[PDB]
Each structure stands twice: as structure tokens, then as C-alpha cells.
Amino acid sequence: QQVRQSPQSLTVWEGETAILNCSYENSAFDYFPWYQQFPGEGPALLISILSVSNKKEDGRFTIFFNKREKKLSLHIADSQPGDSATYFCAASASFGDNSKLIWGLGTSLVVNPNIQNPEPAVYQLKDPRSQDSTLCLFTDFDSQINVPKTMESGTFITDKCVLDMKAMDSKSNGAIAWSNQTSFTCQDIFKETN
Amino acid sequence: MSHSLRYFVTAVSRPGFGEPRYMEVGYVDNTEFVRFDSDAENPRYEPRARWIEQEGPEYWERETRRAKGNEQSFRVDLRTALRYYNQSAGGSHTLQWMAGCDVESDGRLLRGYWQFAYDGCDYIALNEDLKTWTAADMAAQITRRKWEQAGAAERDRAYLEGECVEWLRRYLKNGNATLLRTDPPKAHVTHHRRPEGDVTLRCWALGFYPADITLTWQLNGEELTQEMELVETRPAGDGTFQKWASVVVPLGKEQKYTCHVEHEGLPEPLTLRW
Amino acid sequence: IQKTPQIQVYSRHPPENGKPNILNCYVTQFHPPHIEIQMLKNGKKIPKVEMSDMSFSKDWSFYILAHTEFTPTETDTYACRVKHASMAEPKTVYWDRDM
Amino acid sequence: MKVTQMPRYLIKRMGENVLLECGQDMSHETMYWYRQDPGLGLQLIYISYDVDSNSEGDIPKGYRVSRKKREHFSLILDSAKTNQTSVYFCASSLGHTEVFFGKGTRLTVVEDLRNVTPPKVSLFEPSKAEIANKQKATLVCLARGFFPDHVELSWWVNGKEVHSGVCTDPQAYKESNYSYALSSRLRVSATFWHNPRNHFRCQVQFHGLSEEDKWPEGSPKPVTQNISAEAWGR
Amino acid sequence: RGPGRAFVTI
């Protein structure tokens, strides 16, 4: 309410400038820190600005501030998949009577890798066991493809997961599926390419 | 010319007598215009000058909240000081704070202030660069390291270069009639024979404003360095000031010594004698 | 530490017998801020004495301005008595009208 | 120059008392306790300005705190409810400046301790169709059947933990009501995989019951443990 | 208007 971030979720492609918006209601707010939180970790101060400034730059990160409109934004230049995180904007009246920080609800950022010449295929992997080795591996598909979901019992398809082979310098999309029913193959489960 | 907006703050611990005494006083130049007292019947910022009364209810509510927030900081600080210096919790101690801006004719910032004192002695002070701190002892070195890591000076500088300067301009405007007025000094010379032949000639200057004044007993040119004793300029109830200067002269030759006052409230410097 | 108060006593206008005036007691340069100040008429405490609240100068030292309305006579004496932890005994400064 | 939080993971039966501890080394006077539901925002439970100087946050109900020393800040749950299952962050700052957060505490309040179970970890060798047509080899690790979702998956190659070519699911998925599933994959060159002396291991660390909890003696006690799956190259 | 400590304690 007091601090409102938008959008809830933002998806950009790498190399593009990511822009995370925020507006506030209390005109007495004069301190605006942005916190970056990676999954499984605690938030950490990324960059902050005072209301007397219109711009604050630190590396690829810039805060632009408009006091009259009670609006600001975090700009991430040359965004990388590693920037994928939840970004919180907060605010406080520094000359107020308490040390409480007023938090925005956060914006989850997803930075897609640039997939040049996508070659999407589905591979079946096998484990040193007998029962279901139907582990479908959907990989090397383009970043705008929506990975299908399933309602079948015992069958499940994971969300898209981006890995970075730092050596060889290569990023690729991936999704894994399995099912207690080998009655299904791996091609019935998905519907993209081979 | 040069003007200033400054706030003078005191926290005084008083074990066994409740929470620390907390006081904030605001000055434009040397004129008090606002005051907060924690011991007042109703703890809130109060007007102390005429021209500040025109500020709306939101002004007084905002400033009161600021003072109450500050009071809590100083409460914790007084306890922290006991830790640092390894002092007993049974004695009274003081923490003082002065912050403000000196601004010249254009609007340029001459100097910004943001400094502290503990038990009457320098503790820590923001340097003229408004970026670095000067710590006065080992306890203050801890404070300096904490404030450096926290980047505390950035907001302080923002206040001094911005808010302080802007509001001083407003205050000078609204209080122009009294703040920037001039009252000329009324001067006279007294005569007292010391029990040892000589004569003490004292030159008085009364009812002048502002306090800045030059009192000079003369001779035959422009000497009289250190045989003329002064008193520091002292205030009156009505906001005006008084001051005197005296010299010891041989009996009879009192008529060669002359007194001269210099003040911006005068068209020309006064010339007095006995 | 402890700083000894400086005490100055003076009238607003040049003293004239039978003419109402204002007598001031200006106490400066002391620490700690706790202090007791009394203005005296013929050795007796003056009832209605106005006094400023706790305030300090740029050098961190505290000061207090006390004043009262009075009418000088040639027989009446006036003084200001100050008690402070920096002094072993209270200090009384007499108003010198001839200065 | 950090905030330390213990424990990192915790499992409690409803009704039991909970104590989360926190420490900071920055001489900060102000400390905080936050809770954060997965994918949601930071909710302030309590703020402490000094020793024995605490104030309620937005959601103090069901919680209380203890600040007897400036360096520490304890969060106390007298009677744990299931809706208090969340991630708790301790924090400190020097007033309105940088807030330092701990690494967090994953607290899960369950109705029945007997359904806490370690994961079954299975490692899948790469498809030769991938190796031939793309010159890359993707290992896939799958952990299933565990409850609650207190698992940490890591990849180890030749005795060293790798981070490159690795992508693990950010959040476990619920198979049933008492069964979670987490997957991850490691992708290396076909060349690196064809080396028979390269050792791969998918380690899944499960955070379960501590030691003081009582468990029957007709079944293994779901204690905090590491469960791995190894494989060699061609 | 006056300065704030902003709870930046010593």
C-alpha cells in the first residue's frame, strides 16, 4: 500500500535493460534502499538513493528518482541470467520517530538467455534400476516456449531451468519429466520438437 | 553577509530521576525560534519567535515526531557511552549535539556542522568536506568506524546542503522584520578614580542589534592593544546587546583618550570622551 | 570534567534612583548543566525571577540568563548568588551600579 | 560483518515451544525478526532498539522475543501452530542504513512427526542421442519421497563441488500430501563424460529430526543426513 | 526544520 512495486514478475532477455518500478504514497519518505534476494538466501542491500537525488549509479545498476510524482525505478543495464532474483524496494521517513523500514512486496526478475539456433529435443535417460526410468529431458528449446504441464496421475513436469556452462560459454534451457506410468512414453508427455 | 540555521541538542542522564532530560533548541543566527523540552507539561516543539507561529499544524507535528525519534536515539547513546568508557550507571552524563549550516549572501554553503560532545568534551565531528569524521578519543573511534561502514554522513550532508539552506532562506524571509533589523548602540563614558592616583575610563555600548560591534579606546592614531580590558558582549531580555571597554589613564590627561564604537546600526562611528 | 561558571550582573539601562529598570544575571561557561541561581535584594531572595532554560554555546559550555524588574535606590544592594559543583562554595557577585 | 542465524532448518510438532537464536558482530543497536512465506514479502514480527527495548511489528501475534544482550536477539514461539511454518530472517542495522540479513531459518511445523522421511536419490546417466548430436552430456539427479522439503542438493565432481553447468529446481514439488520431489541436472561436454576416471556425485542433504525427538525402535529415525548417488564416465 | 539522528546511534 505505502510502497508499491510493479510488475510482480518481470521477464527480460539478457543484454536488455531491466526496469523495475516503484511508487510510494508518503511524501515524507526520503530514503529508498533496494535489496536483492537470491533463492535460498537472505536479502542484501544492492543500492540506495536519497530523495534529494534524481539518479544513483553503481556499476550496471541505476536508481532514477522522481520526487514530485512519488515514483522511482531500478534500471539494470546489460542484464545477465545471474541477475535473476527477487528485488525489493523499501522506504522510510529518516526523520520520523521509529527505525522501521517500509517494504515493497518485491519484483521477481527472470533474465532469459539468448538462444541462437534453438535445437529442441526430448531425451530418455535411464538409471541403474529396473522400474520407471522414464526420465524425459526436454532441452535446448527457445526461451519463449511455455513448458507444458500435466494433470495425469503419477506424471509430473518441472518448471524450465536455465544452466550456465561457464567453460565453453554456453547457456541452455531445460525441463525434466517423470511418471510411475511407463504406459506413457516421453513424446506423449511433451509437444514441441525432437 | 552571512547567516545561519543551527540546532542545539542536549541529553542529560539522571539515574533515579527517570528518563534523561532531552532538549532541542533551534536558532536563526543567534535568535532562538523553536524549543523542545522533554520535561515540559506537554512534550512538543514550541514556537519561541513571532515569525515561526505562521507555520501550519503539520510543521509542529513533524518536528515533534522528529524530536521524539531523536530522543530515543540519545537515550540508547547514553547507555552505549557507559559501555565504551566503562562507566558506572549511577552518575549523570551529558551528550550534546550541534548541527546546522552557515550560508553566505548568494546561497552558497560556507560550512556545515554535525558534531557531538560527551560530558562537555568533543566526541565526534563531521569534517568540512561533509564526508569524513574526526573522532576525539578511543570511544569515538568505534563510533567513527560504525558510521563509516553505515555511510551515515551521506544523509547528514544531504540535510546540510539542502533542507538546512532552503529552510533558512524561508525563515529569514518570514522573520525579516526582526532578524535583519538594526538597532544603534547608545554609548556613554563613566569615570572612576582608583585608590592609586590613576583613573579608570570605561566606555559603554547599550541596546544594539545585532551583537557584532567594535569597541575601541584611542590615543593619537590606532593603538591600544592590551591595556584595554573587555567584557564579552552580553544579552538583554529584549534581544538587544550590551558591552563595555575600559582603560587606565593618569589623572588629568583623561581628555586625550577617546572612545569609538562601530556598528551597522550607525550611519557613522561614534566618538566619545570624558 | 567541570567548568567554573562566569557571572556577570548588569542593568538594561543606566541606573537612576526611583526609575524602574531590569537587572540581569548572566551565567556562562559552566559544566555540568545543573546549576542553582538566585538574584538577591539586600541579601534576600527576589521572588519573581525569570530564568532561561538549559542552553549551550558552540564551545559546548552551558549558559543561563536570569532577569528581574526592579527600582534602584541609593541604599538598596543587589547581587546574584550561584551554586555549582565546580565551586567549593556558592559565589555571590554584587551589582556595581557605579561601573 | 554479518548476521548469524541458528538453526538453519528446524522441525517441530504443533504445540511445542520454538527458539530461534541470532547474533551480529557489528555493534548494531537495532535488530529485527522477519518472516517470509515462499514467494512473498517480508513481514516484520518484532524490532529491538536496545536491550529490553522491544516493540511489536506488523504480526507479533504468536511470537515473543528476548533481547538480554546487544549481540543477540531470540525469537520465541510458546506453542507452535502449523501456520507458523515459514522462513524466518533475523536482521540488524544502524538505524536507517544498510540492513544485514541472516541466511534464514526454515521452520516447518507438522501435525505428525512420524511422516518425516528422508529422500530417495536416483542418478540418471546421459542419453547417447544427446552425446552424439550435441556433443554434450547431461546428468540428472532426482530426489523423491521426502518430507518436509528441507533438502539441499549439490553436485560433486572428482571430490570438488561444481557450480558451472548446474541447474537445480528452486523449489520442491509436492507429489502427494507427505511426499516432495526435487530435481537437478549437471551438463558437461561429451569429452568430459567419455573420460572413465571422472567421478560424478549428486549429494542431497536432508534436514530432519534433531536428536532429542523421540522415535520408535521398529524403524530408522529420520535424522539430518546426506544421501548421495555416484556415477563414472564412459 | 531540524536534523534527525535517523537512529544512527553512536
Residue numbers in the entry:
A (entry chain E): 3 to 196
B (entry chain A): 1 to 274
C (entry chain B): 1 to 99
D (entry chain F): 1 to 234
E (entry chain P): 1 to 10
Verbatim from the authors:
A key step in T-cell-mediated adaptive immunity is the triggering of cell-surface αβ T-cell receptors (TCR) by peptide-loaded major histocompatibility complex (p/MHC) proteins on target antigen presenting cells. Whereas antigen specificity is dictated by the amino-terminal variable (V) domains of the αβ-receptor, signalling function is mediated by the non-covalently associated co-receptor CD3γɛ, δɛ and ζζ dimers, which bear cytoplasmic immunoreceptor tyrosine-based activation motifs (ITAMs). The B4.2.3 T-cell hybridoma, derived from a BALB/c mouse immunized with P18-I10 (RGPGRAFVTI), is sensitive to picomolar concentrations of peptide presented by the MHC-I molecule, H2-Dd. To gain further insight into the dynamics of TCR/MHC interactions, we employ complementary biophysical methods to examine the high-affinity B4.2.3 TCR in both the liganded and unliganded states.
